[PDB]
Design a protein around this nucleic acid. Structure first.
Lengths: 88, 99, 500, 94, 105, 91, 84, 94, 106
DNA sequence: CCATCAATATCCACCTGCAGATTCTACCAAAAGTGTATTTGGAAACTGCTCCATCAAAAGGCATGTTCAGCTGAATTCAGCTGAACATGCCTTTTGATGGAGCAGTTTCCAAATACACTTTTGGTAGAATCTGCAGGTGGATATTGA
DNA sequence: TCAATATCCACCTGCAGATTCTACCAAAAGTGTATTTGGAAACTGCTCCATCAAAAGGCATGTTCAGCTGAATTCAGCTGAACATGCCTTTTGATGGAGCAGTTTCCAAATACACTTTTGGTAGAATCTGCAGGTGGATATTGATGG
């Protein structure tokens, strides 16, 4: 045992290659180059850089230690990517 | 001897049709959650996340990736090509104004 | 200073793991971690900081003590922590790091390797009942670590099956260094003059004496010669640089009879063969399988029939890509040989092994996959298709399709083989729908239509049971490449010196 | 257990008005609520900007009509303008 | 006696729209007919989108409106697509579209 | 050679590039199509002209990037169409 | 008030060529000019219509630069130097 | 004539502080005014929206600091936050 | 007799900014340090853009800031370009930028 | 491949005159700051409470790794040809001056929207019971593909 | 034409989610006075916008031809389709507790005036000047002649 409670890594490579393949297939991509994955992961990290920063700032102002879905959707709508279904 | 094999592209079109006719999430939940938590820690430690927040991140990221891949496919088609390369991604992002 | 400076890099590599090494950087504190039962299970607690203190103090007379202490810490961490716990994964990662780091420095010191190897948890047997085994984590009674009895047979020191047998060690006659016997591949019978280190022979000029107990020097047979020729031709046409010479020899061949549980008894000839490959300058056994052959004089329906009783293989063949092709080549060569001899029908029982059960080679590697029945059927179908492509096999079907094509109506027309599942099914039916059983196991059994070797007396290999018993008793495991090499050397020595 | 504000009942009544025999899932219901809230926010913001442009401190039906014309597409804008005019006339005559 | 929504003949809550406008800090004062007009516009848009979603569900052999039907209805209408060009949907998917060059022969 | 010369010349300068009278006439015609009897300020016409020049410059640079993306130096209608579609002005 | 028509031809071919040169375009095909004129007409429909509606909202009969600036801002085409 | 306020004097003083020997044209001053008005509008809108988000009817320096961090990227945001905090501390110290 | 703008050590008008915030109907109440923070941020941004315009003018041997120099200066700064990515300055032009392909390929 | 007579757009060395930016005096309604009583949005203090993290285990849907080749991406020629560069002609675009259509400045006051005290209605919603559309597995007729 | 294979579709069954009541209860909605103020309407001075005169800096056509481009050709190799292997994510179930938010108390800060203080376009007067062309070089620079 010796448990009861819980490194800053294993984040960018967490997105699997078949996940990127499925995302491309949903977008109508028929042929995928073998080296698309790394820059796709980089662009994804850029998007998270843009979104989670605003979400974290909103949470910090609210004197809260937990990020809520309202903050996430609100950062999404302030960035021009308004999302529906998480406004409850 | 002679194994049955589809011509390349047919299964790709089948997968495209299947994923367009369905709306389920394609990125695995746990690695995406780990990435989100790591980026949040890069911002500020001790910041908890709700399950609805993680689902919202996953949905938004999947939609953005789908749109980017559609633009990338259009850019690849523009050059009489059917394969996606980083130049298509860069052109699509530059036109979108993100870069 | 020499020992400290030699052993510091591996210990530092163990420390630098993050966060694998974090729980092991300090002594385990039951009070701090809330684990009062730690001392009840681990009787010798110690950690990496203790290792560093001993190295700095020079408490180690020779590095094997340090290796034993590190592996004891690994074993204690594995035992106390559950397999699903993160501490178990951290300990496993540290063990892998130690294994890949100690070997170069430990060799540069002048030894074989820096690993403390413990044998697999082999299940003990019984002397009285002769058919009872002691499962793991079960209490038993042992006498002189040589005789064993179970709980039921009691109605002798009491022991538990959760222990491990350490690997043997050898000491150089001149240098005096201690090293693993398996890693150096030294046997007393092969070299009665003792064990001499490689460096010591380098100071002598004369290399190690040639081993006459090799697979190449085994008695040759026309079937084995044909199989080895086919395998060598396939390897040559592939021309794989990593591929080595393969020797196929028949080490056991005799005549027996099967008794019905219709002729009272059916005579047959049994033959056993193995495949050995040249890896790293030594022979490694990677294939073995048993056949039963009924000639033209056998009463029907077994007349002119070959049956594959057991089939075993080792996944250490090099290259791995050609392993399946080599197995196919061996089996297709056997089928061609029996077709040339005049046999008409062949039978294959494609039944995957159960977990913990060994057909021929004891202690299969943990990473060796036990194929599912569908995968085994697909493999056999691919092999039969390949053989048909070479106009060798006339046809191949399943037992149910063959039976319904032959319009069989009586159980006496069914083939009878030793230890075969169908005689057991018939006996159960008699004691207590046959076509239903045939259809249920339709894909399991394969029936193949195809259209002078002297008898070798070998009591050791006369059946898989004695071979498995000797392998278990002598700890001849196949869980690693070095262990497989040691087992192959030992079996070659046993066949050469204990032949009849 | 705070009072959570939503347009659930009114949107369900509208659905009955257009599709009496068709239901709506909770996820799609939240989609509709979020869409209506977003449109409300857009119209209110545009009306506020219109009022600020003319130095007006009060927002009337004309401001919302202009906001709808600016935001909604042609046919949708015309239909919404007609519906709003009919609603205002009915309320005045009530 | 009669609610403002019933008086104007609209299902959407007029008084609630007025309250939200007042609390939204959009302007110092809000006209009487402004909540009525806004509620009418919102109800018209909701009715149009619900009718389109029901038509899509009928074309999809389904009797319950799902986000897939909603997104199909939104994208199948050019004006609705233009209005919601910067709106992300949950569990909505994309239109079936295969590029001409990707098509065989 | 020369084409690059006027490219550099127009990139260096900032003067208005569309003639004032034709642009004013086009704006008047399109507004009359929207609504007749509509007076125009000179500042409004200048604002329309500058906004249109900026939009056309952005469209042209995106179009050139698309054209060189297809290994070409001459822009095609597909370049403008796809640039506008990715910009969201079309789909 | 004369009814103006066929004023799209006022965007001359040299003007479109110069605009392309300002954008770094080296070569222009013959049919680019008409498409550019159509795109400019679409942009004018997007902007001037909004400006007209803004002017009508203010009960004014003259279009001012402030209405144009607000219409451009609401369409994500914010312009400086003309107020606002 | 109705007075039309502008940041002309303040922008001119800032320019003189930064570049004493550099002048400014009327068009450049108009661009200055448009830019400062747009920045003020954006930051005020962000602060108002954020105050609405947390059910807060009062906008303080914390809301504006958060909105500055949201809007300004990186170094601009850090320097703006530092100078705003210094100015607030100086104001509250008297 | 000390103004709030001079009290906070800022050149931008604190009172004017506070009055504009009140007039914009952004919120019911505005904090006292809110106009001070607004003035500080606006003054910082104005000083940054003005110093960039001055550097651009100096690079072109000019003594008066023109919209061209300002547009070049802000487009040069990646942070300023991101801030004003959807902003057009009248009479500002574009950055001189020629693709290597557009250059002669001898 | 390239060293270089010769026609050409333009950086700079320059400078002068003017529209534009800068300097000074005065005025005053528009803000701006200070003073005081009032109201309140929000800080702290404690706690009830809901979902956030963490731990355990099986196992099957894919993540991972390997192989063959179909054909896709990439490189090379070349010829029809669309456009670039340029001389020629002329005319349309640009600038300035001049009547009045509406843009704003002033005053009344009336329909219109706050402020607020109740009263009644009405939307979440605690909680249990019955209805119901499609999640999921089965089977076989039906296109779809490749040789 | 035919065999291997994914698809459509009808059908049957278990269940979390959508739908129907019972009773509640606080949050608004509406109604009836009192007050105030946004602006419709009438009248009117002041812009500046449409219209028209000439002066000029360009635009509209046709010609010639070096070069952009798309069709045709060929081929190295890239990833798609198939298959073996096995990995680890999901769901189910539970739990210690960090953390969210309701409730109460109460205070520094925001607010509504009133008065006094400063003050920034604003209008007119007069001074200063940055640079837009233009004139005389003149300088890379590139198409072209030729070594």
């Amino acid at each position: 045992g010796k448990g009861g409670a819980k490194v800053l890594r294993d984040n960018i490579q967490g997105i699997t290659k078949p996940a990127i393949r499925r995302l491309a297939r949903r977008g109508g991509v028929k042929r995928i180059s073998g080296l698309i994955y790394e820059e796709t992961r980089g662009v994804l990290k850029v998007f998270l850089e843009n979104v989670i920063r605003d979400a974290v700032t909103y949470t910090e102002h609210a004197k809260r230690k937990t990020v809520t879905a309202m903050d996430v959707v609100y950062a999404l709508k302030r960035q021009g990517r308004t999302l529906y279904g998480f406004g409850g | 001897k002679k194994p049955h094999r589809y011509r390349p592209g047919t299964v790709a079109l089948r997968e495209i049709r299947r994923y367009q006719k369905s709306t389920e999430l394609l990125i695995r939940k746990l690695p995406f959650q780990r990435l989100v938590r790591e980026i949040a820690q890069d911002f500020k430690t001790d910041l908890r996340f709700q399950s609805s927040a993680v689902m919202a991140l996953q949905e938004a990221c999947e939609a953005y990736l789908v749109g980017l891949f559609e633009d990338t496919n259009l850019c690849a088609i523009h050059a009489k090509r059917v394969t996606i390369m980083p130049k298509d991604i860069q052109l699509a992002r530059r036109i979108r104004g993100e870069r | 200073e020499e020992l400290r400076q030699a052993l510091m890099p591996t210990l530092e590599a163990l420390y630098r793991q993050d966060p694998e090494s974090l729980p092991f950087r300090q002594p385990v504190d039951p009070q701090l971690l809330g684990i009062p039962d730690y001392f009840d299970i681990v009787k010798n607690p110690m950690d990496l900081s203790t290792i560093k203190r001993k190295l700095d103090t020079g408490q180690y007379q020779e590095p094997w003590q340090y290796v034993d202490d590190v592996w004891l810490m690994f074993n204690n961490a594995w035992l106390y922590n559950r397999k699903t716990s993160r501490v178990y994964k951290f300990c496993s990662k540290l063990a892998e790091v130690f294994e890949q780091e100690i070997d170069p420095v430990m060799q540069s010191l002048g030894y074989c390797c820096g690993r403390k190897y413990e044998f697999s948890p082999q299940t003990l047997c019984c002397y009285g009942k002769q058919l009872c085994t002691i499962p793991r984590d079960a209490a038993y009674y042992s006498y002189q670590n040589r005789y064993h009895f179970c709980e039921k047979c009691f109605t002798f020191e009491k022991k538990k099956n959760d222990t491990l047998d350490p690997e043997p060690f050898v000491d150089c006659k001149e240098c005096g260094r201690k090293m693993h016997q398996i890693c150096v591949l030294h046997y007393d019978i092969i070299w009665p003059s003792g064990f001499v280190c490689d460096n010591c022979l380098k100071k002598t000029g004369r290399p190690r004496k040639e081993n006459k107990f090799s697979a190449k020097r085994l008695q040759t047979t026309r079937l084995g010669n044909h199989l080895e020729d086919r395998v060598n031709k396939f390897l040559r046409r592939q021309n794989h640089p990593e591929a080595g010479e393969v020797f196929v020899r028949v080490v056991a061949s005799s005549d027996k009879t099967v008794e019905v549980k219709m002729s009272e008894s059916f005579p047959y000839r049994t033959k056993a063969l193995f495949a050995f490959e040249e890896i790293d300058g030594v022979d490694v056994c990677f294939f073995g399988m048993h056949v039963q052959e009924y000639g033209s004089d056998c009463p029907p329906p077994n007349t002119r029939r070959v049956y594959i009783s057991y089939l075993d293989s080792i996944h250490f063949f090099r290259p791995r890509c050609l392993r399946t092709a080599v197995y196919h080549e061996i089996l297709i060569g056997y089928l061609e040989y029996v077709k040339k001899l005049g046999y008409v029908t062949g039978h294959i029982w494609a039944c995957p092994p159960s977990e913990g059960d060994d057909y021929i080679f004891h202690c299969h590697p943990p990473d060796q996959k036990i194929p599912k029945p569908k995968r085994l059927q697909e493999w056999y179908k691919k092999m039969l298709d390949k053989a048909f492509a070479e106009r060798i096999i006339h046809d191949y079907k399943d037992i149910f399709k063959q039976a319904t094509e032959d319009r069989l109506t009586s159980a006496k027309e069914l083939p009878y083989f030793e230890g075969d599942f169908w005689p057991n099914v018939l006996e159960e039916s008699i004691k207590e729908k046959l076509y239903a059983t045939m259809e249920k196991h339709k894909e399991v059994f394969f029936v193949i239509h195809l259209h002078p070797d002297p008898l070798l007396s070998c009591d050791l290999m006369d059946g898989r049971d004695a071979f498995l018993t000797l392998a278990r008793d002598k700890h001849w495991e196949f869980s690693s490449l070095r262990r497989s090499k040691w087992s192959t050397l030992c079996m070659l020595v046993e066949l050469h010196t204990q032949g009849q | 257990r705070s009072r959570k504000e939503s347009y659930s009942i009114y949107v369900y009544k509208v659905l009955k008005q257009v599709h009496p025999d068709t239901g709506i899932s909770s996820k799609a219901m939240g989609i509709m609520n979020s869409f209506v809230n977003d449109i409300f926010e857009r119209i209110a913001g545009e009306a506020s900007r219109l009022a600020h442009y003319n130095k007006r401190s009060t927002i009337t039906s004309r401001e919302i009509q202009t906001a709808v014309r600016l935001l909604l597409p042609g046919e949708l804008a015309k239909h919404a303008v007609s519906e709003g005019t009919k609603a205002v006339t009915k309320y005045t005559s009530a | 006696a009669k609610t403002r929504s019933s008086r104007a003949g609209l299902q959407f809550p007029v008084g609630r729209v007025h309250r939200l406008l007042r609390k939204g800090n959009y302007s110092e004062r809000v006209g009487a007919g402004a909540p009525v007009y806004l509620a009418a516009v919102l109800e018209y848009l909701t009715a149009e989108i619900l009718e389109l979603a029901g038509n899509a569900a009928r074309d999809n052999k389904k009797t319950r409106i799902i986000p897939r039907h909603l997104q199909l209805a939104i994208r199948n209408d050019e004006e609705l697509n233009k209005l919601l060009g910067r709106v992300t949907i949950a569990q909505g998917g994309v239109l079936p579209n295969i590029q001409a060059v990707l098509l065989p022969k």
